Amino acid sequence: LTSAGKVRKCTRPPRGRAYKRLLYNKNFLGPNNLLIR
Amino acid sequence: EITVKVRKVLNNPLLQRQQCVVDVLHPGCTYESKEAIKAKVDQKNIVLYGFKTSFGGGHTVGFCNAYQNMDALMKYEPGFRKIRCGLIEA
Amino acid sequence: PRISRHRNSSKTYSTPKKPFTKPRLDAELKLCGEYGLKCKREIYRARYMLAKIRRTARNLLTLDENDIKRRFEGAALLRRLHMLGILDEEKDQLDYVLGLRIEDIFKRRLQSVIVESKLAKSVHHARNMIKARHISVGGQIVNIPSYMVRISNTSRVAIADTSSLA
Amino acid sequence: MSKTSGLYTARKLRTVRRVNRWADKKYRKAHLGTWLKANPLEGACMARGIVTQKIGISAKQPNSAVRKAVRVQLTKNSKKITAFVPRDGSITYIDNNDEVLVAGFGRAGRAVGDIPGCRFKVIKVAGIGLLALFLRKREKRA
RNA sequence: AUCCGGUCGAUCCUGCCGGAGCGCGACGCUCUCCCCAAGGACGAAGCCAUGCAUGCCUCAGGACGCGGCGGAC
RNA sequence: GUCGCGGCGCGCCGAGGGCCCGACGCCUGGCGGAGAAUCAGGGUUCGACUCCGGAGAGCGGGCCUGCGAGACGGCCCGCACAUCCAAGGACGGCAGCAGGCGCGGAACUUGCCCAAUGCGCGGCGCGCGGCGGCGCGACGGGGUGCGCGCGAGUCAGGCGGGCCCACCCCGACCCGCCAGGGCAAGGCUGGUGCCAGCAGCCGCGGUAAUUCCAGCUCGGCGAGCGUCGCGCGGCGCUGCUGCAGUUGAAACGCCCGUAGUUGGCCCCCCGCCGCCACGAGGAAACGGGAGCGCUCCAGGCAGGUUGGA
Ligand SMILES: [K+]
Ligand SMILES: [K+]
Ligand SMILES: [K+]
Ligand SMILES: [K+]
Ligand SMILES: [K+]
Ligand SMILES: [K+]
Ligand SMILES: [K+]
Ligand SMILES: [K+]
Ligand SMILES: [K+]
Ligand SMILES: [K+]
Ligand SMILES: [K+]
Ligand SMILES: [K+]
Ligand SMILES: [K+]
Ligand SMILES: [K+]
Ligand SMILES: [K+]
Ligand SMILES: [K+]
Ligand SMILES: [K+]
Ligand SMILES: [K+]
Ligand SMILES: [K+]
Ligand SMILES: [K+]
Ligand SMILES: [K+]
Ligand SMILES: [K+]
Ligand SMILES: [K+]
Ligand SMILES: [K+]
Ligand SMILES: [K+]
Ligand SMILES: [K+]
Ligand SMILES: [K+]
Ligand SMILES: [K+]
Ligand SMILES: [K+]
Ligand SMILES: [K+]
Ligand SMILES: [K+]
Ligand SMILES: [K+]
Ligand SMILES: [K+]
Ligand SMILES: [K+]
Ligand SMILES: [K+]
Ligand SMILES: [K+]
Ligand SMILES: [K+]
Ligand SMILES: [K+]
Ligand SMILES: [K+]
Ligand SMILES: [K+]
Ligand SMILES: [K+]
Ligand SMILES: [K+]
Ligand SMILES: [K+]
Ligand SMILES: [K+]
Ligand SMILES: [K+]
Ligand SMILES: [K+]
Ligand SMILES: [K+]
Ligand SMILES: [K+]
Ligand SMILES: [K+]
Ligand SMILES: [K+]
Ligand SMILES: [K+]
Ligand SMILES: [K+]
Ligand SMILES: [K+]
Ligand SMILES: [K+]
Ligand SMILES: [K+]
Ligand SMILES: [K+]
Ligand SMILES: [K+]
Ligand SMILES: [K+]
Ligand SMILES: [K+]
Ligand SMILES: [K+]
Ligand SMILES: [K+]
Ligand SMILES: [K+]
Ligand SMILES: [K+]
Ligand SMILES: [K+]
Ligand SMILES: [K+]
Ligand SMILES: [K+]
Ligand SMILES: [K+]
Ligand SMILES: [K+]
Ligand SMILES: [K+]
Ligand SMILES: [K+]
Ligand SMILES: [K+]
Ligand SMILES: [K+]
Ligand SMILES: [K+]
Ligand SMILES: [K+]
Ligand SMILES: [K+]
Ligand SMILES: [K+]
Ligand SMILES: [K+]
Ligand SMILES: [K+]
Ligand SMILES: [K+]
Ligand SMILES: [Mg+2]
Ligand SMILES: [Mg+2]
Ligand SMILES: [Mg+2]
Ligand SMILES: [Mg+2]
Ligand SMILES: [Mg+2]
Ligand SMILES: [Mg+2]
Ligand SMILES: [Mg+2]
Ligand SMILES: [Mg+2]
Ligand SMILES: [Mg+2]
């Protein structure tokens, strides 16, 4: 055990009903597609 | 306030009193106290209790014990209501 | 014991069995769009409140048209379903209860009623106006968006006399 | 009919079911009582103990790695277990006398994945949750 | 009154392993407002400092005491 | 002898009594029911704790007083443990309410009050019980905006309350937690190079990684999300409804045969079973269910001649 952590050591939107409204209008082709963003 | 009505009046000549339910109506404003509307419901023989205000306001319901004598009130009234009216204070 | 040990309580919604099904996942958000729904629980509640009135009818329909249980409970069920406006007068058959959908339940919410009479421009503006104690039912100020309005009490939905919009 | 019928055979139908119920491995494991005796945790969700050593364990055939684990002595029955430490760099919070809260891997007492002979895992070290120690929300004294 | 991933070069099966739901506790992280509400039971019926959990009414100013009912609920 | 019947005890006489329709013995991390968790129908599992019944008060025994106790906030003795002491003696029982130690993964204040519901004596008593405190075990409602007005807080007066507070009324100021190859909704840059690590199961990583560690973006549930263990479901993989037995696991080498299970057809209009239906009688709470706007709701039994069917 001398290697543990090797890679580790070497490396407001709207809320509630308004967030669901945002998703409703945003959706109504993939959500995280490359072409859109 | 301006509107005071009473129902469910029961005469009780065993406890020397009369029991009532009182409805108080004050649309828009408060009714300021029980000591205020005590005039509409002598005065010193009236025992007012159990008043609740509904949601939004405008309505209040309470209960009245109206005695006829004065010994009767010091005899048949709970010992903490006589202190809420200042009548004894011990 | 204490007296509070004798008080009842109950859960009022049922979660679905497969969470990650796409067609009902977007059908479930069209519903959150047409009505100002906070979260999925308010859909679940609705379905739960349907699943009971559907269980009653199917129990009575298995019975016979002249039994007293049908004559008593089906009449009670129909008389309750007509006052809330979940079911309408022209359908006074117990078999007309089975073809009911959730949308019929959602249409009698206060948030929906005030939109229909155009007191509010949309359903989101309606929810905001509900929270602001700006609307009264029969002279009684009601604060609850989810309030269920009976057909008797739908003539009498207004802005509250005590208000900053009066 | 390969099963007895007849209006007065309830006793036989019950005896057959009582006898053949024990043939299922799930029922026998959960109802016999030998697994409860042999269980290091004694039928509990979790258990605390002290660390006696730090170790590295080879993986199984198609994988190649050195997994990090600790030998633990149980407080309540003095048994010997080995428990796995997940979450990169977490083996560095485990001194040789560190009270550890230990739970299971899932699978109700079966080894998972590629770690031979490991059925338990550390969830808390010296009073502090190990996951929050990795996520950098709390820290150990010194 | 519903299934899905894993045995092969590919295929149809038997068969288990794994996943997906509800409940009860324990652990972690996190938390604005209001109503209801469980809370040392879980092979320790192990051990207990301190205070409180049972009193109320025939014969003389009163206590005190005697007598009485209760302390088995 | 007992309140009383009885092998309950004693003397005498006889040899009975129970059993594969499972006796006897052993084991139980065994209190029983009303009930609870799960969910097509049939079922499986659990019955610590609210009501009803039983048993106990460190462990054995014994007893007095009383209508009623084999009483432990009564007494006596043995044992195992503690207490004060001038050393002669005296003395204890929280599985009551708080509180502490120990143990465990795991569980709150050494508060105020007899105002209510009831009980003893009649006026009091009561850690029954009531009211506050701690309380993300769990339940229910509403927010973090809408196209321009609110709530959370602040300060006053009411109402309420044994006294204070919370709720309600009037007045003036003002997310998070898990993920992103498949099961299963959701994809570009840097680092690392079978190492570190991930991964319930398939699998990923060998110096171009859709999976490790990070950044951006996106997905799900949401004041709540993830992990561990267990019950039920999934499961027609326990099968009565309803499995399988040529070759996948599975028909005794064969014949006889008791208990057990099963047994053709026929008389109708009696008796005795079973069976079907309807009654009587006994507990409520829970579970269903008629009626009622605690602002809705989880609730409750309310209420405006009434009602709790
Ligand atoms: K068969
Ligand atoms: K069969
Ligand atoms: K058979
Ligand atoms: K038969
Ligand atoms: K069988
Ligand atoms: K099923
Ligand atoms: K396969
Ligand atoms: K093959
Ligand atoms: K297969
Ligand atoms: K305990
Ligand atoms: K106990
Ligand atoms: K246990
Ligand atoms: K437990
Ligand atoms: K204990
Ligand atoms: K007595
Ligand atoms: K006594
Ligand atoms: K005898
Ligand atoms: K004898
Ligand atoms: K003999
Ligand atoms: K037996
Ligand atoms: K036990
Ligand atoms: K069933
Ligand atoms: K069954
Ligand atoms: K059933
Ligand atoms: K089933
Ligand atoms: K309890
Ligand atoms: K008990
Ligand atoms: K009990
Ligand atoms: K009880
Ligand atoms: K009882
Ligand atoms: K009892
Ligand atoms: K008892
Ligand atoms: K007892
Ligand atoms: K005992
Ligand atoms: K004792
Ligand atoms: K004892
Ligand atoms: K004893
Ligand atoms: K004893
Ligand atoms: K007795
Ligand atoms: K005795
Ligand atoms: K005794
Ligand atoms: K004590
Ligand atoms: K106990
Ligand atoms: K207390
Ligand atoms: K401890
Ligand atoms: K501890
Ligand atoms: K009292
Ligand atoms: K008495
Ligand atoms: K108390
Ligand atoms: K405001
Ligand atoms: K305010
Ligand atoms: K402001
Ligand atoms: K404001
Ligand atoms: K304002
Ligand atoms: K990760
Ligand atoms: K698993
Ligand atoms: K799987
Ligand atoms: K797989
Ligand atoms: K690279
Ligand atoms: K099954
Ligand atoms: K089943
Ligand atoms: K089934
Ligand atoms: K078969
Ligand atoms: K074999
Ligand atoms: K074989
Ligand atoms: K074979
Ligand atoms: K055979
Ligand atoms: K055989
Ligand atoms: K034979
Ligand atoms: K034969
Ligand atoms: K034969
Ligand atoms: K035979
Ligand atoms: K026979
Ligand atoms: K048989
Ligand atoms: K037979
Ligand atoms: K036969
Ligand atoms: K019958
Ligand atoms: K009763
Ligand atoms: K009447
Ligand atoms: Mg003999
Ligand atoms: Mg029981
Ligand atoms: Mg019980
Ligand atoms: Mg208890
Ligand atoms: Mg006692
Ligand atoms: Mg005793
Ligand atoms: Mg512990
Ligand atoms: Mg609310
Ligand atoms: Mg089954």
Architecture of domain B3-85: 2-Layer Sandwich (3.30)
DSSP state of C73: I
Q: How many CB atoms lie within 10 A of CB C73?
A: 17
Q: Give the full edge-to-edge strand order of the sheet including C140-141.
A: C140-141, C135-137, C157-159
Helix, strand, or coil (residue C48):
helix
Write the CB contacts of C107 (distance below 8 Å, at least 6 apart in sequence): C85
Strands C157-159 and D128-129: unpaired
Distance D129 CA to F106 C1' (A): 17
Put simply, the chain C residues between 11 and 50 with a CB less than 8 A from any chain A CB are 26, 29-30, 32-33, 36-39
Q: Entry resolution in angstroms?
A: 2.8
Where exactly are the structural domains of chain C? 19-166
State the chains in contact with C (3 or more Cβ–Cβ pairs under 8 Å).
A, B
Distance between CA C164 and CA C143 in Å, rounded? Answer: 16
Q: Which residue has tokens 């490991």? A: D118
Question: Could you tell me if A29 lies within 8 Å of chain D, comparing CB atoms?
Answer: no
Tokens of B14: 């065993």
Cα–Cα nearest to C104, from C152, C54, C65, C66: C54
Q: Which residue has tokens 């089975």? A: C98
Q: How many residues does chain C have?
A: 166
The per-residue DSSP string of C9-20 comes to --------S-TT
Test mutation, A1, A6, A7, A9, chain D, max D CBs within 10 A? A1
Where exactly are the structural domains of chain D? 1-142
Distance between CA C28 and CA B66 in Å, rounded? Answer: 61
The per-residue DSSP string of B19-76 comes to EEEEEEE-SSS----HHHHTTT---TTEEEEEEEE-TTSSEEEEEEEEESSSHHHHHH
Torsion angles phi and psi, residue C92, rounded to 5: -110, 40
Q: How many CB atoms lie within 10 A of CB C110?
A: 23
Q: State the structure-solving technique.
A: cryo-EM
